[PDB]
Amino acid sequence: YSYTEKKRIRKDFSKLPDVMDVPYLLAIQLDSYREFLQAGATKEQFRDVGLHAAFKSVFPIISYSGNAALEYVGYRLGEPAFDVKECVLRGVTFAVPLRVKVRLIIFDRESSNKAIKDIKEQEVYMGEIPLMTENGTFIINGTERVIVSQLHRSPGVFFDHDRGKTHSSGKLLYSARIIPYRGSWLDFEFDPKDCVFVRIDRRRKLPASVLLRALGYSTEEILNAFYATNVFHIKGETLNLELVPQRLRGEVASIDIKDGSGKVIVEQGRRITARHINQLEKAGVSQLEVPFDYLIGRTIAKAIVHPATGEIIAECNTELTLDLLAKVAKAQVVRIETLYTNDIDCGPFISDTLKIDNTSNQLEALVEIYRMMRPGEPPTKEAAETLFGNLFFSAERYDLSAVGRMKFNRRIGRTEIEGPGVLSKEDIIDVLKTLVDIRNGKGIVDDIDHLGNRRVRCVGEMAENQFRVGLVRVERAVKERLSMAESEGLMPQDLINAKPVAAAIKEFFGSSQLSQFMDQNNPLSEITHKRRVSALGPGGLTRERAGFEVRDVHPTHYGRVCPIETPEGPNIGLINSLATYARTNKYGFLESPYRVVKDSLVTDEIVFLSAIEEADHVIAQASATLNEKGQLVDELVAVRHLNEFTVKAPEDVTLMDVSPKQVVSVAASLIPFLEHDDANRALMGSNMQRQAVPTLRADKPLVGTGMERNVARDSGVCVVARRGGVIDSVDASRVVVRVADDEVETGEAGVDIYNLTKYTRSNQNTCINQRPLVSKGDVVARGDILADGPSTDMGELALGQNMRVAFMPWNGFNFEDSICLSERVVQEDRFTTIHIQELTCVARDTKLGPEEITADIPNVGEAALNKLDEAGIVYVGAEVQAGDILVGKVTPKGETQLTPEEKLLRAIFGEKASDVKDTSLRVPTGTKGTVIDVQVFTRDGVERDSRALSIEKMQLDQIRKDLNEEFRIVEGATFERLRAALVGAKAADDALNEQLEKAQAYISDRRQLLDDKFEDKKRKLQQGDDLAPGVLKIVKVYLAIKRRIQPGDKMAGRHGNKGVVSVIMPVEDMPHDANGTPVDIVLNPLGVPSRMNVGQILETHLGLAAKGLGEKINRMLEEQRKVAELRKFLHEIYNEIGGREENLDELGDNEILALAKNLRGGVPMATPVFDGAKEREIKAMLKLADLPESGQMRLFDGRTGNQFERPTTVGYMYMLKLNHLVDDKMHARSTGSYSLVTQQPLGGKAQFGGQRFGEMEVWALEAYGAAYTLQEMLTVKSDDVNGRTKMYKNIVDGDHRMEAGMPESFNVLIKEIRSLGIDIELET
Amino acid sequence: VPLDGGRFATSDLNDLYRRVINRNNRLKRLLDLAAPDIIVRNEKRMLQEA
Amino acid sequence: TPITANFREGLNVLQYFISTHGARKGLADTALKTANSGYLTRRLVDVAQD
């Protein structure tokens, strides 16, 4: 029971006990990047991921035709350049120095330990680490950025089953695909002619016999791997067959096998059965008589060379014919060799493909594969043999990660958990053995949608791979330079180049689709964007080639991936957020927590289960019948056995869920009564809370889900007290707390300054401020909330505001989705927001004349001189509007060529001619605001103007007053503790003098540190920034726009109910009750049946009891009731309904008046996403507040005055406001500027706004009988220079006429088609 | 069209026309230098590829 | 096994996961019909203009 909960208590209706608390919502980003840094310095550095792994693979350098070895000793991280607050204003990207220690080992290239030179030099500033902040955001060029996770395929082997798309051969499950981590991939496909074919990562077709010959195996060795060998001998009846009872199972015999010394087995035309199978084991016969006609279908395994003849009479792996017996009979070959064959099962599919290809020799197959990858190349035997061996048998250009070796052993069936990265010869032939088994009917194809086959990357894995591809470029350039140079002639620092390393980091944060801008509107959008994992980007499928399997949900997404949270639009299913209890595995898979269930009771042991291991155990439901003994009392409980939903017995439960909210995400955990809404509205409701704008007044919702408190602490906008203690002094700008003597060090105990940030320009042009909520004299602890950020109220997330809502069609204003508002919603300034716009100006360096920023400009009126200062910067606090100038920038010009019409104008004015033009920055049309801050930037070496000294002086004065204030607190604290130690002065002594000498030396240590903390800060402020070449001074002015709610704005709720305000009606026309309380928002009740959201109505009824009970508490305070009477009323609320009840633990007088004043505007209610209150509990709360349990009441009209016939539903609903203002949507333009090649109107400039007349707009006009209108908006209104000029003059005179003209878009096609040599007779 | 900063922009077609003009002048000046057959067949292909 | 409860009485954690299979497939089709119907009306209007 902390201190922040003593102000506002939220009643929860959760009836299930909590077993595991919600972990850190950003644990997947902090722990993933911590392994990349590895700040821990021990003897054995744990190398699993990060830059330490790349410094161990490419560390040894094998110099060609030389002896130069480089040994990497280690690395050391340096101190940051600037602070997190100084980098956002200067743009230093928060770089981190990278220092590496390399050892130069020289040798005489003699493979001996002679003349060994050991040079140890540590390189400095080799690279720049991003060094993200504590919240997980990256600061790049002063802009906040994040790194989203990537969901791609896991490295390994996968088998596919084509749906008869090759040749309509039914079902073919022989599509084998291997996807390694790095390098080319090899795929095995089956031809429609029952022939195996290997495919390299290129458009080609290679036979399976060439892959076995290139590996080194002959035709006889490869034939033994496909089919087993058999034995045969010619004795007795000219032959003897080795009968195997297992091979003859399921094979029809058309021959006589009556051998066995008068014992018949199978007659002619009899199918062998299980009864005939058992007849062979009891007899034990091994030799049978088979005619020579049956052996024709068989084939030999190896070549048959008789020693008496001396020549090869039968080739290896060749079919048998009638002439082969004639050669074998005369040779009398006692030993006969053949291969296994069976038409019932284990068909020889690969045996027929070996005879199709001419793979006679192993060296002939190596040059054939090299020709397929490079047609027309030189046919060299030594050159082609080196490239093939370095493709699938070398560490270069082929790297298999540890996550791929573990997955490859599980699919094949190997018992080795860890394997080598380079593929072996046994691993290549093992894939072909598993492919032919799935074709015969042994095994099934794998599924690509299973989470066990997918892998979720992190920010630490992408940074390590992008750093390795940049490190190999600097390692290769240093190898070609150090090998041809002497070790004594070349310095160790100049041997390596830091250009490819520093360039790879800059391009990763500026040219990658994953690294994107971070939307900063509300604390809910900050956590959702960091957790959001996408499937697009490098090494993943795009939006077009996805299809329908990737864009669908799989039953394995239970507790790992949110099924309901998905951004609508073109990318539906590709981007999906994680779950609440989602945790990454050791290899990179997703894991979900589960409880251990025994046969008698449920233990408290919580284990994290993977994806592939969840198919064995039976996962029960999160909510089940509990008899207060740990055993399920239900007769049937909903369980999941193998990716299916079915009821099972309670005696078969092995695992149980932790919480029902482990399936939904963080954004979906904030919608109350989610179990009553549809899955379609839950997806749209999760987007309305994401695009929310923080209002001016933050009000906590009356109904919540419980996750609104744990979502503001994890966000970085809230100020959390690190060290608990007594608040010494609090202000609107900073909060200073005094640390207690218990949780403090020996020196500098009470040193903690919390500086609250003011209104700054966010990424989405929204204000961000922090307000204190604690007073002086209140003790705090670790983890308490001192100040809240935007959209936060006392630690609870407050996106929008609440008001009285009704449900009735009011004069058709709420037609389909429109919302009708009253006048009190705009009079109280509830939805009034604050927008912050940034305007920047840069002083270029023209080739004509270089000039800096000067305030004196020619051709200006006296109205601009009063507002503009003498330096050239508008004062802070003026009402800058459209047409007002911000800074003064002169532009030199030449060759004016004054026309005679201009000479007359310059004479009637009297002023002299000025050639310098005025190109100063101004406010765009339709933008009005107030300047709140002005920032200036001066390059290094330039002279500071009168503006750079005004802000710099005010900044150091605030730091000095803040440092002297903290110095006064620690000064009085050291004297108070010293005066509380000795006895009082009246009228040992040596020990007290040492304490006085220690106190004199204590204030000297803080004084010596006072100047060091003040000298370096003055050094950073006086140091100029490294701007881009070609700029002299860059100034940035901020404008504050207070946009009020107006008709046309977009407003929505939390259940996916969008709306546009139509008319702001007065307070008299709104329907009121008998007491005289009018409603503010009127909705449309016709949207409930189609858009099925029952939770929206249950929220309105529950919201009435929250505000209804708040009026009784506020009215009870006005009667001056006793404190003992208020504690009874609070006990009738928390300790009456089912759920959590907390009371009888606070102070009598102090805490009662504090809760009664905070709960006077509504009692906050907590309703879980799946443990919500039933209908009987909602009606019980209305009975306590003396309200009708039906939730409906008849309202009186304000215009006609008559009472309505049917009762309407009233209540309080939490509404939001989306960032869809009409000021940025309304546009209009009559005449503007055009381009050069095509005389078309432009857009995107200061003045713009136009609609593109697409092709579908043309077919709509052709459907009518309109002909003059279609030709007007295609020839006259556009692409006509002389046409628009004469048309504009006809409108001013008052003559509506149109000329034919010529479209400018057609004259371009004529000139471009004539340069090709084609003649066009346009005139004719 | 020049833009801010003293810089200007050139279309991709200006580079193609420049490549075919300079190679045409290299062939227009090698008509009286008694060029052998080894180079008179390759200098024509430089213009055909342009 | 069907879903016994309804929207008023409230769905379970496992019963709500079943309704997501049909909802996501419905939201994925409305994003593809906008491209196929727009492509179908372009081929039919190009043959019925004259």
Side-chain angles (χ1 to χ4, degrees), chain A residues 1-11 13-31 33-42 46 50-58 60-61 63 66 68-70 72 74-78 80-88 91 94-95 97-101 103 115-116 127 130-133 135-143 145-160 164 168 170 176-181 183-185 187-190 192 195-196 198-200 202 207-208 214 216-218 224-226 228-229 231-232 234 236 238-245 247-257 259-264 266-267 269-277 279-286 289-297 299 301-303 305 307-311 313-314 317-327 329 331 333-335 337-338 347-349 351 365 367 369 371-372 375-376 378-379 383-384 386-389 392 394-395 398-404 407-408 411 413 415 419-421 429-437 439-441 443 448-452 454-455 457 460 462-463 465 467-473 475-477 479 485 489 492-493 496 498-532 534-535 537-540 542-564 566-567 569-575 577-585 587-590 592-599 601-613 615 617 619-626 630 638-640 643-647 649-650 652-654 656-685 687-698 701-709 711-721 723-726 729-740 747 749-750 752-772 774-784 786-839 841-851 853-865 867-880 882-892 894 898-910 913 920 922-926 929-938 941 944-967 969-977 979-985 987-989 991-993 995-996 998-999 1001 1003-1004 1006-1025 1028-1030 1034-1090 1093-1110 1112-1118 1120-1124 1126-1136 1138-1140 1142-1144 1146 1148-1149 1151 1153-1244 1246-1247 1249-1320 1324, chain B residues 1-3 5-50, chain C:
Chain A
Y1 188 71
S2 65
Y3 163 75
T4 180
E5 309 186 65
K6 303 181 178 180
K7 292 182 175 301
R8 199 160 185 165
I9 309 176
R10 209 152 194 171
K11 176 179 174 180
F13 291 102
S14 158
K15 290 179 292 296
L16 299 187
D18 45 349
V19 285
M20 177 181 180
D21 201 4
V22 182
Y24 207 88
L25 288 180
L26 298 180
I28 64 179
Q29 280 280 355
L30 303 185
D31 296 327
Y33 196 78
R34 182 179 179 178
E35 290 171 58
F36 177 77
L37 294 176
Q38 201 173 350
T42 57
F46 185 79
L51 77 172
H52 193 278
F55 287 158
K56 285 300 182 61
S57 279
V58 299
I61 291 186
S63 316
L70 286 180
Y72 286 175
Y75 81 107
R76 186 176 182 178
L77 294 180
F82 292 87
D83 208 2
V84 71
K85 293 184 178 181
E86 199 75 19
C87 202
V88 76
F94 208 77
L98 184 58
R99 284 86 177 269
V100 62
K101 187 179 186 301
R103 294 179 175 179
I116 304 178
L131 196 57
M132 78 172 189
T133 62
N135 297 329
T137 68
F138 289 82
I139 300 299
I140 297 299
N141 301 121
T143 318
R145 287 173 171 263
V146 293
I147 305 300
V148 301
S149 300
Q150 193 177 15
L151 188 62
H152 73 313
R153 293 182 177 181
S154 282
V157 53
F158 303 98
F159 298 89
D160 186 68
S168 294
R177 196 170 185 175
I178 301 180
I179 305 179
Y181 187 82
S184 72
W185 48 79
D187 302 331
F188 296 92
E189 302 286 342
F190 273 27
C195 274
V196 311
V198 63
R199 297 192 59 177
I200 208 179
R202 202 166 182 172
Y217 297 102
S218 198
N224 296 327
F226 293 147
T229 60
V231 304
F232 280 101
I234 51 171
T238 182
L239 58 87
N240 275 321
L241 188 137
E242 175 72 283
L243 179 56
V244 194
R247 294 285 281 101
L248 212 61
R249 178 61 181 92
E251 299 183 2
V252 63
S254 87
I255 48 184
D256 295 84
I257 316 91
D259 201 4
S261 300
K263 186 58 181 181
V264 71
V266 176
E267 71 186 12
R270 182 205 305 182
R271 200 204 73 86
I272 177 154
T273 50
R275 288 185 53 184
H276 301 83
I277 286 287
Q279 191 257 357
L280 270 298
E281 284 101 11
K282 63 102 174 180
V285 63
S286 315
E289 195 270 341
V290 174
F292 298 99
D293 301 0
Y294 180 77
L295 269 300
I296 309 179
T299 185
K302 62 188 63 179
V305 173
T309 56
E311 66 276 355
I313 68 154
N317 193 23
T318 180
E319 74 281 346
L320 179 134
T321 51
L322 60 88
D323 66 343
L324 258 58
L325 287 65
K327 299 180 180 180
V333 301
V334 182
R335 186 62 174 182
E337 299 88 3
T338 186
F349 288 93
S351 297
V367 76
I369 299 180
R371 189 183 181 181
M372 298 297 300
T386 300
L387 190 149
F388 170 72
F392 288 87
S394 159
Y398 187 85
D399 190 13
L400 187 62
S401 45
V403 75
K407 192 177 183 59
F408 192 86
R411 180 61 182 182
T415 180
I429 57 179
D430 213 335
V431 180
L432 196 50
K433 291 183 179 179
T434 300
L435 182 56
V436 295
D437 294 359
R439 184 61 179 90
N440 302 327
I448 60 179
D449 273 357
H450 199 59
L451 282 184
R454 273 189 165 183
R455 177 190 177 185
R457 283 185 175 183
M462 313 168 191
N465 294 129
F467 181 79
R468 196 182 194 276
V469 76
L471 183 58
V472 72
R473 296 180 179 180
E475 207 83 9
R476 187 258 304 180
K479 179 177 62 61
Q493 186 172 173
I496 52 181
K499 297 183 179 181
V501 179
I505 306 299
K506 186 187 305 302
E507 64 197 26
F508 174 70
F509 294 89
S511 61
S512 88
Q513 308 93 17
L514 299 179
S515 192
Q516 48 192 354
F517 278 160
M518 172 188 181
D519 44 349
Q520 193 173 15
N521 294 116
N522 43 359
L524 185 57
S525 280
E526 299 190 11
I527 310 183
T528 308
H529 201 289
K530 299 172 185 178
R531 185 166 273 194
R532 158 186 292 183
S534 44
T542 176
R543 315 175 186 181
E544 281 298 4
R545 72 175 185 180
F548 275 95
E549 311 196 350
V550 177
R551 301 188 177 183
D552 206 330
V553 66
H554 212 265
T556 177
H557 292 160
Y558 182 82
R560 303 180 183 89
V561 183
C562 201
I564 61 180
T566 294
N571 47 3
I572 291 180
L574 297 177
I575 293 181
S577 161
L578 268 298
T580 303
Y581 296 86
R583 178 193 174 185
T584 62
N585 210 334
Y587 296 91
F589 299 152
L590 290 180
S592 186
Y594 291 98
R595 302 174 62 178
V596 182
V597 177
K598 299 296 183 179
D599 63 88
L601 75 163
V602 170
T603 42
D604 210 5
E605 178 178 352
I606 308 177
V607 295
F608 290 85
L609 184 45
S610 45
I612 53 179
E613 298 184 14
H617 313 277
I619 295 88
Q621 198 180 358
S623 165
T625 300
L626 301 179
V639 300
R640 299 186 296 107
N643 309 334
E644 288 154 78
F645 172 77
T646 59
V647 303
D652 207 8
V653 172
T654 300
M656 197 176 182
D657 299 330
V658 194
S659 279
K661 63 176 58 181
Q662 76 178 6
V663 187
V664 307
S665 88
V666 185
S669 308
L670 266 63
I671 300 179
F673 295 88
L674 187 60
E675 73 274 3
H676 301 285
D677 294 355
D678 200 1
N680 286 326
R681 285 306 168 180
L683 189 139
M684 298 182 60
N687 294 15
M688 308 301 107
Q689 303 177 357
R690 190 171 181 266
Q691 305 171 169
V693 177
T695 62
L696 188 59
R697 294 181 177 179
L702 296 186
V703 54
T705 77
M707 291 294 303
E708 291 187 336
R709 187 173 303 273
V711 73
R713 176 170 297 180
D714 299 328
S715 159
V717 299
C718 204
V719 182
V720 182
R723 316 301 176 182
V726 182
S729 87
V730 70
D731 293 80
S733 198
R734 64 176 182 270
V735 177
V736 184
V737 292
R738 174 185 177 182
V739 185
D752 269 325
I753 302 298
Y754 293 94
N755 202 332
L756 266 64
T757 179
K758 282 309 176 183
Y759 307 92
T760 78
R761 180 252 176 183
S762 199
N763 295 17
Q764 311 295 141
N765 295 20
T766 318
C767 77
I768 292 178
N769 62 330
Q770 298 172 349
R771 313 174 185 273
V774 67
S775 171
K776 175 185 176 181
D778 296 359
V779 58
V780 301
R782 185 180 184 91
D784 206 329
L786 300 182
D788 60 62
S791 293
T792 312
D793 178 70
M794 298 181 181
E796 301 183 12
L797 199 66
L799 304 181
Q801 298 196 20
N802 57 5
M803 46 201 53
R804 206 175 193 89
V805 61
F807 282 89
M808 48 167 298
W810 193 75
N811 289 325
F813 282 83
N814 43 3
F815 194 70
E816 293 184 13
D817 281 33
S818 315
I819 320 296
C820 169
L821 261 59
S822 187
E823 204 177 11
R824 296 299 172 87
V825 62
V826 75
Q827 185 172 334
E828 294 179 349
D829 302 68
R830 289 195 173 185
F831 287 91
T832 298
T833 66
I834 296 179
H835 288 59
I836 307 301
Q837 192 176 181
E838 177 184 6
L839 305 179
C841 166
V842 55
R844 295 299 182 180
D845 188 9
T846 58
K847 304 299 178 59
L848 279 79
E851 200 63 72
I853 296 179
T854 43
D856 297 0
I857 56 178
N859 191 89
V860 75
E862 283 306 278
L865 176 47
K867 183 58 64 183
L868 186 59
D869 209 13
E870 64 266 348
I873 293 93
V874 194
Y875 299 99
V876 179
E879 46 100 20
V880 176
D884 191 319
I885 66 164
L886 275 298
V887 297
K889 181 176 59 181
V890 293
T891 54
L898 300 180
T899 60
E901 295 287 340
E902 195 75 17
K903 179 61 180 181
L904 171 74
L905 300 179
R906 304 311 305 272
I908 203 179
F909 267 88
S920 57
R922 287 187 173 185
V923 190
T925 180
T930 305
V931 180
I932 49 180
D933 195 68
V934 171
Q935 303 182 9
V936 295
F937 299 95
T938 307
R944 314 296 287 269
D945 46 358
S946 87
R947 185 63 62 175
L949 59 87
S950 315
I951 294 92
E952 186 183 11
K953 180 189 300 179
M954 199 173 185
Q955 288 186 178
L956 57 91
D957 287 329
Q958 183 68 26
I959 301 179
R960 189 178 71 257
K961 290 192 303 178
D962 179 72
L963 183 53
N964 287 130
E965 211 281 332
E966 193 268 344
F967 179 78
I969 298 181
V970 299
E971 187 78 13
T974 297
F975 272 88
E976 169 175 67
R977 193 165 299 182
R979 290 296 178 88
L982 76 163
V983 305
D989 181 68
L992 298 179
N993 293 16
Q995 299 290 148
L996 180 57
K998 191 259 300 180
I1003 70 154
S1004 159
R1006 312 302 172 184
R1007 186 71 69 90
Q1008 283 288 343
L1009 293 179
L1010 190 144
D1011 59 50
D1012 280 355
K1013 289 187 59 181
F1014 194 80
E1015 192 268 332
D1016 69 330
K1017 280 187 168 298
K1018 192 186 304 302
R1019 152 188 168 88
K1020 297 182 184 62
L1021 295 182
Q1022 291 180 5
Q1023 180 176 174
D1025 53 328
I1034 301 179
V1035 288
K1036 296 181 179 181
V1037 60
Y1038 297 99
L1039 264 64
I1041 310 178
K1042 191 183 65 177
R1043 276 184 163 87
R1044 201 179 55 183
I1045 174 174
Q1046 47 193 343
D1049 195 298
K1050 169 180 289 295
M1051 291 178 53
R1054 290 188 296 176
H1055 299 266
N1057 179 267
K1058 305 177 181 180
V1060 179
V1061 295
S1062 303
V1063 177
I1064 300 184
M1065 272 315 178
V1067 288
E1068 300 89 7
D1069 301 2
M1070 307 304 299
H1072 64 84
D1073 203 2
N1075 300 331
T1077 58
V1079 298
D1080 298 359
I1081 282 189
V1082 179
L1083 299 182
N1084 200 328
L1086 293 179
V1088 180
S1090 314
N1093 45 4
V1094 178
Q1096 186 178 8
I1097 306 177
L1098 266 64
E1099 181 179 358
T1100 305
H1101 286 159
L1102 183 60
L1104 185 57
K1107 196 65 176 60
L1109 288 172
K1112 292 178 58 61
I1113 301 182
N1114 191 24
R1115 191 188 67 180
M1116 195 174 300
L1117 294 178
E1118 312 319 324
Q1120 300 291 336
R1121 297 295 181 86
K1122 199 64 63 60
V1123 187
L1126 267 68
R1127 302 173 64 93
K1128 182 181 180 180
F1129 190 82
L1130 292 179
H1131 188 274
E1132 215 180 12
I1133 302 179
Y1134 298 94
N1135 302 269
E1136 270 298 273
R1140 306 299 180 88
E1142 294 84 3
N1143 209 25
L1144 299 181
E1146 306 168 353
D1149 196 0
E1151 301 305 82
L1153 54 88
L1155 283 174
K1157 287 181 174 57
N1158 293 22
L1159 301 185
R1160 76 190 309 179
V1163 181
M1165 316 306 301
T1167 294
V1169 288
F1170 287 100
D1171 303 68
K1174 298 171 297 182
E1175 198 41 62
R1176 52 167 293 271
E1177 296 182 353
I1178 302 182
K1179 297 183 178 181
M1181 298 184 55
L1182 295 174
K1183 183 173 57 61
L1184 182 57
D1186 284 356
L1187 293 182
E1189 297 176 349
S1190 315
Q1192 303 178 357
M1193 55 181 61
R1194 298 179 181 88
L1195 263 56
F1196 286 83
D1197 205 332
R1199 305 209 307 184
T1200 61
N1202 285 17
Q1203 194 177 197
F1204 296 151
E1205 300 184 3
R1206 293 178 49 86
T1208 176
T1209 294
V1210 300
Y1212 289 79
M1213 183 178 178
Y1214 194 72
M1215 277 294 186
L1216 305 181
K1217 177 186 177 182
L1218 311 190
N1219 43 14
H1220 278 60
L1221 278 294
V1222 299
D1223 312 328
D1224 313 328
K1225 300 300 182 178
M1226 179 182 61
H1227 289 279
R1229 166 187 170 278
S1230 158
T1231 50
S1233 198
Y1234 311 94
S1235 164
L1236 274 79
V1237 194
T1238 42
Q1239 298 288 336
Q1240 297 186 358
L1242 303 187
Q1247 199 299 318
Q1251 196 79 10
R1252 179 187 301 268
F1253 201 73
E1255 182 64 353
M1256 313 199 76
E1257 302 285 336
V1258 185
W1259 296 332
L1261 290 181
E1262 301 183 29
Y1264 294 109
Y1268 290 93
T1269 66
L1270 177 61
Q1271 200 264 350
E1272 173 184 340
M1273 55 198 58
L1274 259 64
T1275 79
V1276 175
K1277 297 174 63 181
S1278 159
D1279 308 334
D1280 217 334
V1281 176
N1282 45 14
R1284 253 179 284 101
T1285 301
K1286 298 186 301 179
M1287 184 57 188
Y1288 202 95
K1289 198 65 178 181
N1290 293 331
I1291 299 299
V1292 181
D1293 295 359
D1295 194 7
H1296 288 354
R1297 208 174 75 259
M1298 175 190 296
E1299 289 86 3
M1302 187 67 60
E1304 283 282 346
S1305 159
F1306 183 74
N1307 289 333
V1308 176
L1309 191 59
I1310 293 298
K1311 298 302 179 180
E1312 287 175 346
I1313 205 181
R1314 283 185 178 180
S1315 159
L1316 318 178
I1318 304 300
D1319 184 20
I1320 295 295
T1324 73
Chain B
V1 288
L3 72 161
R7 208 182 186 181
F8 58 94
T10 181
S11 192
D12 294 328
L13 194 57
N14 290 320
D15 186 30
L16 267 298
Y17 285 155
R18 181 180 56 91
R19 186 176 300 179
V20 74
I21 281 181
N22 52 49
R23 292 198 177 188
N24 183 30
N25 286 16
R26 198 186 300 114
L27 265 296
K28 203 173 183 180
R29 296 293 99 93
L30 271 296
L31 78 172
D32 49 352
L33 270 295
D37 200 351
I38 175 62
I39 61 174
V40 76
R41 62 174 300 273
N42 187 36
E43 286 175 337
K44 300 301 184 59
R45 293 179 296 187
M46 304 177 181
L47 179 59
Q48 187 173 359
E49 67 94 21
Chain C
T1 171
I3 306 178
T4 317
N6 46 17
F7 278 156
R8 182 194 175 185
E9 297 179 1
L11 300 186
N12 304 333
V13 54
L14 287 173
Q15 299 184 358
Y16 194 84
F17 183 79
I18 299 180
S19 179
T20 303
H21 301 271
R24 175 166 288 188
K25 194 173 185 178
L27 293 181
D29 262 348
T30 187
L32 189 148
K33 300 307 176 181
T34 57
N36 289 21
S37 198
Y39 176 73
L40 177 60
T41 180
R42 286 183 176 179
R43 299 178 304 184
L44 297 180
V45 76
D46 285 336
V47 308
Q49 271 174 346
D50 282 29

